[PDB]
Design a protein around this ligand. Structure first.
Ligand SMILES: Cc1n[nH]c2cc(Nc3nc(NC4CC4)c4occc4n3)ccc12
Ligand SMILES: Cc1n[nH]c2cc(Nc3nc(NC4CC4)c4occc4n3)ccc12
Lengths: 266, 264
């Protein structure tokens, strides 16, 4: 997967930014056509981190997960990925509030599908948020940003450790253990964010304030006009006890079963 | 607006046809000379359908837009326009592969100027394609077939709905929202055809196949010998998100500057 710089064509304008560098829009002269590509460009460990993300990606093959097109060594380092034409879900739901509840369920259910694959493949996302969910169409979501993501060992159930504490489960805070159940906590916080329309979780609260709230059995409320059955599920995602918290299999099922009704019985 | 049939002389051979009727070539006793005219002749609602086309035309005065001379209520209804001596760009370019890159740029830049006028006047062409661009000279093009064109209200940015999918933008296919931004998508499809020398876009594919190809982030490739910068510009037109897509002012500004350099 070492792409040819002659085929790649960049848009001299960014759609991303970060410690890594800039993410510019591009066009890659594919098999017979031209595929629009998102391209992470390195401005060290930044090259090891980008080779990590490139490895976590090359393995994962799922519709609801950003597919990678390949690496491209040229004037700089290029991580070539399948472009999500509409952008990050938090910034998209802020701008478009006419996005009906049904459209929102369909999108979070697509995240629960991609996450269920990540679970089955033995991968921890570790940064699963509204920001890191990008849109192909208004009705097609892909899970992005695999920089904190970790491939698990065959005999291992969890990983043991920058600090997205608002998306983090209590065992990540307290004991640094991350598993697919910790991503189920993040998914809860992500599900909240969408129904809120990109409103930031635990608005104004500091990291320890969030930790203290969750230890008191306190949770974020039901965003305005969110279907009760979705808030029901958020709190289920938000179970303090890791052993009793559902897996993505059971979460995606609850989203699938709800959606199946919603479209037909509504 | 109401032409004397005493001044209108019609030929036998047609320049086109449709459900509307025939497009006979004609001559019109004008000022002190004779103007060559293209005449749309009805074969019901089609009358108020062709009156809609005559109305869009009456309002538009720009060199790169097929001027209307007037109407004629004689044998059958006649819509009298200014003759495009060489005809449709696709057929012209299919039948002329000697036409150089500098020549095609100049013609698509001319389409882009007439389109910048139309955008500024708050009209949506809705049928922009190589076939609806007619050549007056191998160096003077005109936007025609204002059949699908609509005139937006002073407060609306778009229009909400024959259906040339292969030219339509995704927001049109999905939600039926035509605007000058949707005409930029079609403009990009026009720009492709012209460098393809009249080759039909997305050959063999059905409407849904095209739609699926677009959502997959795939676009038509670079036609053979097409200046890279003109291919870079098609992809700009071919922006999925309408908000991030260039307008006609932005499209003309890129063609004007390229051509400014290319000729000089
Ligand atoms: C309006 C707007 N802002 N940003 C955008 C980013 C995109 N598309 C996109 N962006 C990536 N990286 C960027 C940091 C997000 C991607 O990475 C993998 C796929 C992918 N697709 C589209 C629109 C916007
Ligand atoms: C060789 C050849 N074939 N067709 C031609 C059409 C023209 N000129 C023309 N044609 C119109 N309508 C035609 C259906 C396209 C026009 O409508 C308004 C103006 C106008 N000027 C010239 C040559 C040819």
């Amino acid at each position: 997967v070492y792409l040819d710089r002659k085929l790649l064509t960049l848009e001299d304008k960014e759609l991303g930014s970060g410690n890594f560098g800039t993410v510019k829009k591009g066009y890659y002269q594919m098999k017979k056509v031209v595929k629009t590509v998102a391209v992470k460009i390195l401005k060290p460990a930044l090259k090891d981190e980008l080779l990590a993300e490139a490895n976590v990606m090359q393995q994962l093959d799922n519709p609801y997960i950003v597919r990678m097109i390949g690496i491209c060594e040229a004037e700089s380092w290029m991580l070539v990925m399948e472009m999500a034409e509409l952008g990050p879900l938090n910034k998209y739901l802020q701008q478009n509030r006419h996005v009906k509840d049904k459209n929102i369920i369909e999108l979070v259910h697509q995240v629960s599908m991609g996450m269920k694959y990540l679970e089955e493949s033995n991968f921890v996302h570790r940064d699963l948020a509204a920001r890191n969910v990008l849109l192909v169409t208004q009705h097609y979501a892909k899970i992005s940003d695999f920089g904190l993501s970790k491939a698990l060992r065959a005999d291992e159930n969890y990983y043991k450790a920058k600090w997205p504490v608002k998306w983090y489960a209590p065992e990540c805070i307290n004991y640094y253990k991350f598993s697919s159940k910790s991503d189920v906590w993040s998914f809860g916080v992500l599900m909240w964010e969408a129904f809120s329309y990109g409103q930031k979780p635990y608005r104004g609260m500091k990291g320890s304030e969030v930790t203290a709230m969750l230890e008191k059995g306190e949770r974020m409320g039901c965003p305005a006009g969110c279907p009760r059955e979705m808030y029901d599920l958020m709190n289920l995602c938000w179970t303090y006890d890791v052993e009793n918290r559902p897996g993505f299999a059971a979460v995606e099922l609850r989203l699938r079963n709800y959606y199946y009704d919603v479209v037909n019985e509504g």
